[PDB]
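Predict the structure of RNA polymerase primary sigma factor.
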Amino acid sequence: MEGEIDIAKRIEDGINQVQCSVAEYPEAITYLLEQYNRVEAEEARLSDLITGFVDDLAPTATHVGSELSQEDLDIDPELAREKFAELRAQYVVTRDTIKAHATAQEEILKLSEVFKQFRLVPKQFDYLVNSMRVMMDRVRTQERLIMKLCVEQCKMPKKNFITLFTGNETSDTWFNAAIAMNKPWSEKLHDVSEEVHRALQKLQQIEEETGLTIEQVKDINRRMSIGEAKARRAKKEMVEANLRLVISIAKKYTNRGLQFLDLIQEGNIGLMKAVDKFEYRRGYKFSTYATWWIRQAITRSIADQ
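Done. Here is the predicted structure for RNA polymerase primary sigma factor.
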């Protein structure tokens, strides 16, 4: 046995970070209760929604940092009825204190601790995690646009733009002040007014959709990325540390119908799946765990040609 437990524990930590970031996203919460309002009206199956409940357990968001393509990547009825009830009751209470910061924040930190009890099934965490990235892409589209209009089209140098937008980033309050600074690039910004207003009004929509501020959506996302990058990096090291293994097994299916470099492509896809599904807590030797996956991808592939 090896420090493959140490990469393993690093993979796990990065994946928890992503899960904790999902738990900070309001839309992840609603969607979870919306998907249960699909299980009880039977449009969906609970085993495709969550795995079980936590009261450390291994992460269920197994797809984070995986190098396999998204195409290769694809509960007692009453306890489940109880928990989803506990989520729904705690939600509608937070949904109110949002209207009525230290006390509200301690409940916001609790709706998130209740959400984290749900061991969502991989594909679902994938919906959430992508859901969030696409939203961060909208924030990013509008902010880059705005800087191009101000900094490039109207000639406001970078320095001043940073200074103004970098605050709240949503109300006109920051823009009309650029105009009101009456410097050479100020009146010019009138040729950029409506396009710049619509962005801010589109940026405000993101905040309304998400139920966060632009700075928060960015926050959670930045934190998610640190997690995604830690797991990704760590899985890459697990796959790279086991290419000896892959070559070893492939050398066993040598003149069996599939040529070498293809034999280690299928071997490697078996390894990347192994690196994903593996759990160190279970006490088994990775080397052995990987072998069933590596081999299966190799034999399986030999059967198709």
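The chain has 13 helices and two strands.
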